[PDB]
Design an enzyme around this catalytic site. Structure first.
Site, PDB file in Angstrom:
ATOM      1  N   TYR A   1      -4.334  -7.770  12.001  1.00 43.43           N
ATOM      2  CA  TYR A   1      -5.455  -7.632  11.095  1.00 43.43           C
ATOM      3  C   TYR A   1      -6.793  -7.993  11.728  1.00 43.43           C
ATOM      4  O   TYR A   1      -7.725  -7.185  11.761  1.00 43.43           O
ATOM      5  CB  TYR A   1      -5.223  -8.525   9.885  1.00 43.43           C
ATOM      6  CG  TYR A   1      -3.934  -8.243   9.152  1.00 43.43           C
ATOM      7  CD1 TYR A   1      -2.720  -8.681   9.654  1.00 43.43           C
ATOM      8  CD2 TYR A   1      -3.931  -7.552   7.945  1.00 43.43           C
ATOM      9  CE1 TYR A   1      -1.533  -8.433   8.982  1.00 43.43           C
ATOM     10  CE2 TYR A   1      -2.751  -7.298   7.265  1.00 43.43           C
ATOM     11  CZ  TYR A   1      -1.556  -7.740   7.790  1.00 43.43           C
ATOM     12  OH  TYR A   1      -0.378  -7.497   7.115  1.00 43.43           O
TER      13      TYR A   1
ATOM     14  N   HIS B   1      -8.643  -2.857   0.445  1.00 45.10           N
ATOM     15  CA  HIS B   1      -7.716  -2.911   1.564  1.00 45.10           C
ATOM     16  C   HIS B   1      -6.553  -1.930   1.427  1.00 45.10           C
ATOM     17  O   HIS B   1      -6.284  -1.147   2.322  1.00 45.10           O
ATOM     18  CB  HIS B   1      -7.167  -4.319   1.698  1.00 45.10           C
ATOM     19  CG  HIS B   1      -6.255  -4.487   2.867  1.00 45.10           C
ATOM     20  ND1 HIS B   1      -6.714  -4.791   4.126  1.00 45.10           N
ATOM     21  CD2 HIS B   1      -4.912  -4.363   2.968  1.00 45.10           C
ATOM     22  CE1 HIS B   1      -5.688  -4.867   4.957  1.00 45.10           C
ATOM     23  NE2 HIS B   1      -4.589  -4.607   4.282  1.00 45.10           N
ATOM     24  N   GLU B   2      -5.860  -2.005   0.296  1.00 41.60           N
ATOM     25  CA  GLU B   2      -4.784  -1.099  -0.038  1.00 41.60           C
ATOM     26  C   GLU B   2      -5.305   0.315  -0.106  1.00 41.60           C
ATOM     27  O   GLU B   2      -4.662   1.241   0.356  1.00 41.60           O
ATOM     28  CB  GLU B   2      -4.176  -1.493  -1.377  1.00 41.60           C
ATOM     29  CG  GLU B   2      -2.929  -2.353  -1.240  1.00 41.60           C
ATOM     30  CD  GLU B   2      -3.242  -3.784  -0.883  1.00 41.60           C
ATOM     31  OE1 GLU B   2      -4.302  -4.270  -1.330  1.00 41.60           O
ATOM     32  OE2 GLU B   2      -2.437  -4.428  -0.173  1.00 41.60           O
TER      33      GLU B   2
ATOM     34  N   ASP C   1       9.505  -8.424  12.115  1.00 41.32           N
ATOM     35  CA  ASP C   1       8.713  -9.338  11.288  1.00 41.32           C
ATOM     36  C   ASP C   1       7.868 -10.334  12.102  1.00 41.32           C
ATOM     37  O   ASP C   1       6.837 -10.811  11.630  1.00 41.32           O
ATOM     38  CB  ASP C   1       9.616 -10.101  10.307  1.00 41.32           C
ATOM     39  CG  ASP C   1       9.988  -9.277   9.077  1.00 41.32           C
ATOM     40  OD1 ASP C   1       9.541  -8.116   8.970  1.00 41.32           O
ATOM     41  OD2 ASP C   1      10.725  -9.800   8.208  1.00 41.32           O
TER      42      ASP C   1
ATOM     43  N   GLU D   1       0.818  -1.212   0.000  1.00 44.71           N
ATOM     44  CA  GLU D   1       0.000   0.000   0.000  1.00 44.71           C
ATOM     45  C   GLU D   1       0.854   1.265   0.000  1.00 44.71           C
ATOM     46  O   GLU D   1       0.561   2.220   0.729  1.00 44.71           O
ATOM     47  CB  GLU D   1      -0.918   0.024   1.226  1.00 44.71           C
ATOM     48  CG  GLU D   1      -0.192   0.292   2.530  1.00 44.71           C
ATOM     49  CD  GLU D   1       0.531  -0.926   3.094  1.00 44.71           C
ATOM     50  OE1 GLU D   1       0.493  -2.005   2.470  1.00 44.71           O
ATOM     51  OE2 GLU D   1       1.136  -0.803   4.183  1.00 44.71           O
TER      52      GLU D   1
ATOM     53  N   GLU E   1      -2.973  -2.088  10.581  1.00 39.14           N
ATOM     54  CA  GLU E   1      -3.661  -3.168   9.871  1.00 39.14           C
ATOM     55  C   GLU E   1      -5.074  -3.528  10.323  1.00 39.14           C
ATOM     56  O   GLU E   1      -5.906  -3.894   9.502  1.00 39.14           O
ATOM     57  CB  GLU E   1      -2.788  -4.415   9.881  1.00 39.14           C
ATOM     58  CG  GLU E   1      -1.688  -4.331   8.871  1.00 39.14           C
ATOM     59  CD  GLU E   1      -2.239  -4.163   7.475  1.00 39.14           C
ATOM     60  OE1 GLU E   1      -3.479  -4.210   7.314  1.00 39.14           O
ATOM     61  OE2 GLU E   1      -1.434  -3.994   6.538  1.00 39.14           O
TER      62      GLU E   1
ATOM     63  N   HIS F   1      -5.802   1.846   3.212  1.00 37.74           N
ATOM     64  CA  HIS F   1      -4.561   2.254   3.859  1.00 37.74           C
ATOM     65  C   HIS F   1      -4.245   3.713   3.631  1.00 37.74           C
ATOM     66  O   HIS F   1      -3.442   4.306   4.350  1.00 37.74           O
ATOM     67  CB  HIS F   1      -3.406   1.448   3.319  1.00 37.74           C
ATOM     68  CG  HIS F   1      -3.076   0.245   4.168  1.00 37.74           C
ATOM     69  ND1 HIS F   1      -2.747   0.359   5.473  1.00 37.74           N
ATOM     70  CD2 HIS F   1      -3.023  -1.061   3.824  1.00 37.74           C
ATOM     71  CE1 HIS F   1      -2.502  -0.875   5.954  1.00 37.74           C
ATOM     72  NE2 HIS F   1      -2.661  -1.725   4.994  1.00 37.74           N
TER      73      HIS F   1
END
Ligand SMILES: [Zn+2]
Length: 627
Positions: free
Chosen positions: A385, A296-297, A377, A272, A319, A300
């Site tokens: 999410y 979704h993108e 990460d 995004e 998220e 953002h």
């Protein structure tokens, strides 16, 4: 003004400090960043200079500390004068700290670093000419979460946002997370990012790209052969999405909403980057069925891009808010039962992610707690999410629904526009916005939502669309056993059955099948291999919506049902199809499906297509086959 003991956990200074950065961003203000980069497809490197406009902040110890990772810093220059720098020894996983002598200058200074990316760069993905259908080299960056420090030296933290301006030179066209400026060919592309963004949102791609309008404020970039296809895919809905999202929150802030459809060998699932959404080609279905992925993108653009998680400890604000707003966009378009179904599938994704994720006890918690040691990460799983969606959804329900919570969404994003925040900063704005609603707002178990691992409180979602999948799916399992004829099956089952199913319903349907149905009263060890008529009768009657689908999402689940149904004839078809897709999530389990049943084909398949996937895709698939 909010509940102990959440207050106990309250950091001392907000936004909470970012442990993932070795830079000293709290001491500087980044007023503007400039990238002058040159793409060499031949050396697999980006080289150039970055120029910051910094202002010294005084509010103890003082120095200039920047993040780098395997990056060749060649020279630094403060206000045009050589400046003395040294690079510390690399520390996993945060990298090398670039220390620069700042003593000499005044409060506001011009910082210019010149650098080359390394062979060890972890910011740029290179594909050769065998790896794209077009036949030219391609390069794209994937910077989240702390990989930007590998593309250029900077304050690599979501709490530092700066406008951008970028000059990128390349033998091949360049797209950027910015809006291209007028130029006056030296092969030098120039862009502006007029809104402040964090460096992880910096996105560059260079390859054989052309473009086409898909809306009044939208253009699509992709390989030429795929150009008219991609345009058809996006061009009907993209402007509608933007407007749906503008109605739920407020006017889109970035000018244009563009989409880069990456090369086929692109192994990821999207990104995004502002003003250029990186999309996967498996979005191209030719019927616009696997399209809601764009919401979704797009979403953002407000949450994450406009209002940023200050750290990867508070990633859920990025998220989770985005899944919420995303499901609100689709809910507005397809109806409430759909968002509830999206939500319900999401609940399923969360539990597989929690059951499975390693150290499910530290990382499954909503608010993470990475110090300077945990690779950011590990903070990226389905939790942010979905559990983040579920907390925002919970808050919506209790406050009296969308019309009562929608005003809070506009205040929140309007209040933190162009800034970063932490969990605690969100809550205050929440509590602050409802004086009257203070009594039930307080009924929320922030401690289990925010700080306990495992599944959150289960929400009641409309199950309509999922009931139909489970019902129809269960029916097949029950009928597999009584009905013995294709013509028998053709009379109990019809194309109308799955007609009104959307892409996500087919995927669940086909997935439920391989789980021998979806009910307590499931035949134990019912196997689809034993009923050759039932399985083949299913793909036969539902050929138009399932088998003839070019939706990679539906196609993969079909191959799975066919590998489960041990239908020996289709293996060549799953083999061939692994040559058409590079997405890690199809290619990988896709090679796992093919290997179990037909080892010799998988190996031949992989041998023919190994060097066409993204190098990482190849290593992981080569691992599974035992090579
Ligand atoms: Zn996202």
């Amino acid at each position: 003004m909010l509940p102990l003991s959440i207050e106990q956990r309250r950091p001392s200074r907000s936004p909470e400090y970012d442990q993932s950065t070795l830079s000293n961003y709290k001491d500087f203000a980044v007023l503007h960043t400039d990238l002058n980069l040159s793409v060499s497809f031949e050396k697999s490197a980006i080289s150039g200079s970055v120029t910051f406009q910094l202002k010294k902040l005084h509010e103890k110890s003082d120095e200039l500390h920047l993040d780098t990772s395997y990056l060749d810093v060649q020279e630094v220059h403060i206000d045009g004068s050589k400046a003395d720098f040294q690079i510390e020894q690399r520390k996993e996983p945060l990298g090398s700290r670039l220390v620069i002598n700042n003593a000499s200058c005044n409060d506001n200074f011009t910082l210019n670093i010149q650098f080359r990316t390394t062979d060890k760069c972890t910011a740029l993905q290179w594909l050769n000419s065998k790896q794209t259908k077009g036949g030219k080299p391609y390069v794209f960056s994937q910077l989240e979460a702390i990989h930007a420090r590998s593309l250029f030296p900077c304050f690599d933290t979501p709490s530092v946002k700066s406008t951008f301006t970028a000059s990128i030179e390349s033998p091949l066209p360049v797209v950027f997370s910015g809006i291209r400026i007028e130029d006056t060919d030296t092969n030098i592309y120039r862009f502006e990012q007029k809104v402040p963004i964090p460096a992880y949102l910096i996105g560059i791609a260079s390859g054989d790209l052309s473009s086409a309008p898909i809306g009044p404020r939208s253009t699509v970039y992709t390989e030429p052969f795929r150009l008219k296809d991609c345009q058809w895919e996006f061009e009907n809905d993209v402007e509608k999405f933007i407007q749906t999202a503008e109605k739920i929150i407020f006017e889109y802030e970035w000018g244009t909403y563009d989409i880069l459809v990456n090369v086929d060998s692109y192994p990821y699932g999207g990104m995004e980057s502002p003003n250029m959404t990186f999309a996967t080609p498996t979005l191209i279905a030719h019927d616009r069925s696997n399209i809601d992925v764009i919401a979704h993108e797009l979403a953002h653009s407000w949450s994450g891009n406009l209002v940023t998680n200050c750290s990867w400890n508070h990633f859920w604000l990025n998220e989770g808010w985005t899944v919420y707003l995303e499901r609100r966009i689709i809910g507005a378009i397809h109806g409430e039962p759909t968002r509830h179904f999206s939500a319900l599938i999401g609940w399923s994704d969360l539990q597989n992610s929690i059951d499975s994720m390693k150290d499910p006890e530290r990382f499954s918690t909503l608010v993470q707690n990475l110090n300077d040691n945990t690779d950011p990460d590990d903070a990226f799983s389905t939790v942010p999410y979905e559990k983040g969606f579920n907390l925002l959804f919970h808050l919506e329900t209790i406050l009296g629904g969308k019309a009562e919570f929608d005003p809070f969404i506009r205040h929140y994003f309007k209040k933190f526009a162009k800034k970063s925040l932490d969990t605690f900063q969100f809550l205050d704005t929440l509590y602050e916005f409802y004086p009257e609603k203070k009594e039930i707002l307080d009924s929320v178990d922030w401690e289990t939502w925010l700080y306990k691992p495992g599944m959150p409180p289960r929400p009641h979602f409309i199950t309509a669309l999922a009931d139909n999948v489970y019902q129809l799916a269960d029916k097949w399992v029950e009928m597999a056993q009584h009905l013995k004829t294709t013509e028998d099956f053709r009379s109990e089952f019809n194309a109308i059955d799955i007609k009104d199913f959307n892409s996500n319903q087919l995927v669940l349907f086909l997935e439920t099948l391989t789980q021998n149905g979806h009910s307590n009263k499931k035949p134990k060890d019912f196997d689809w291999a034993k009923f050759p008529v039932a399985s083949r009768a299913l793909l036969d009657i539902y050929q138009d919506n399932i088998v003839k689908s070019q939706n990679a999402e539906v196609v993969f689940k079909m191959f799975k049902f066919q590998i489960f149904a041990k239908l020996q004839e289709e293996y060549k078809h799953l083999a061939d199809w692994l040559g058409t897709v590079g997405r890690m999530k199809f290619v990988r389990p896709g090679y796992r499906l093919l290997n179990s049943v037909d080892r010799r084909l998988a190996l031949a398949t992989f041998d023919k297509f190994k060097d066409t996937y993204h190098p990482i895709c190849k290593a992981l698939v080569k691992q599974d086959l035992g090579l």
